[PDB]
UniProtKB/Swiss-Prot annotation, chain B:
Full-sequence portion shown in this chain: 200 to 238 of 413
Tissue specificity remark: Erythrocytes. Expressed (at protein level) in liver.
Cellular compartment(s): Nucleus
Membrane-spanning segments: none
Lineage, uppermost ranks: Eukaryota, Metazoa, Chordata, Craniata, Vertebrata
Modifications the protein undergoes after translation, according to the UniProt entry: Highly phosphorylated on serine residues.
Protein name, per record: Erythroid transcription factor
Region (Required for interaction with ZFPM1) residue spans: 4-23
Known function: Transcriptional activator or repressor which probably serves as a general switch factor for erythroid development. It binds to DNA sites with the consensus sequence 5'-[AT]GATA[AG]-3' within regulatory regions of globin genes and of other genes expressed in erythroid cells. Activates the transcription of genes involved in erythroid differentiation of K562 erythroleukemia cells, including HBB, HBG1/2, ALAS2 and HMBS.
N6-acetyllysine found at: 34
Result of changing residue 9 to E/V: Disrupts interaction with ZFPM1 and binding to DNA
Length: 96, 39
């Protein structure tokens, strides 16, 4: 009867389509799944209000972010500006 | 892990209580600022 959908449509980590069961936070454009939203280093749960780093492959937290960057190649000097960073937004609801 | 409580440090907390100043509190120590009235 009624179908409320306003998300992207498909994942960017898996191959599962997006439905009223994502429970993810507002990312750049591609909205992942609750299980698809994991760190690439510690694989821990994210927090709403903190910062995070989005990689071309997966996402990274703000705990090992400084390590992962130097591991890959994104150092901006000791105490210097290396790159941008986004703050974890609020999660989406299935109707509200 | 994520941020830690300013009183305990429950990283496994279901939700983080963050105010305007940025006083990260789990929930247990978080209600201390509300009920007791302390910071
Ligand atoms: Zn997915
Ligand atoms: Zn991490
Ligand atoms: Zn606490």
């Amino acid at each position: 009867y009624l179908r409320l959908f306003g998300q992207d449509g498909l994942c960017a980590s898996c191959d599962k389509r997006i439905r009223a069961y994502e429970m993810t936070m507002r990312v750049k454009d591609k909205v992942y799944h609750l299980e698809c939203f994991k760190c690439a280093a510690c694989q821990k749960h994210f927090s709403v209000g903190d910062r995070y780093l989005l990689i071309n492959s997966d996402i990274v937290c703000e705990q090992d972010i400084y390590e992962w960057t130097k591991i890959n190649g994104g150092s901006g000097g000791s105490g210097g500006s290396g790159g941008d960073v986004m703050v974890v937004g609020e999660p989406t609801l299935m109707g509200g | 892990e994520a941020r830690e409580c300013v009183n305990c440090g429950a990283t496994a907390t279901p939700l983080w209580r963050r105010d305007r100043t940025g006083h990260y509190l789990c929930n247990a120590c978080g209600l201390y600022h509300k009920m007791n009235g302390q910071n």
